[PDB]
């Protein structure tokens, strides 16, 4: 397993030191930030808090926002 203090679906060590979401063939995959693969595609480096289920206290998760599974 991996530790998850807020139960949003993203590990603690990724919310603190950076992460991004990338699609590979037709499937989304949340991944830690790698400056050699992810700068080449223009992806964004996200950071949030490892102990809030939503960082800005709105009713949308940090995982729902960056993946797209959200009210459109």
């Amino acid at each position: 397993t991996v530790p998850d203090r807020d139960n949003d679906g993203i590990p603690d060590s990724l919310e603190v030191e950076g992460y991004t979401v990338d699609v590979k063939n037709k499937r989304t995959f949340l991944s830690p930030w790698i400056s050699n693969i992810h700068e080449k595609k223009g992806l964004t480096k996200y950071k949030s808090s490892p102990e809030k289920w939503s960082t800005a206290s709105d009713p949308y998760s940090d995982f729902e926002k960056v993946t797209g599974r959200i009210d459109k």
Binding site: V21, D22, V23, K26, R27, T28, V66, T67, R69
Partner: peptide
């Protein structure tokens, strides 16, 4: 510009 939407054919 939406990662769930880039899965559709």
């Amino acid at each position: 510009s939406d990662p769930l939407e880039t899965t559709k054919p």
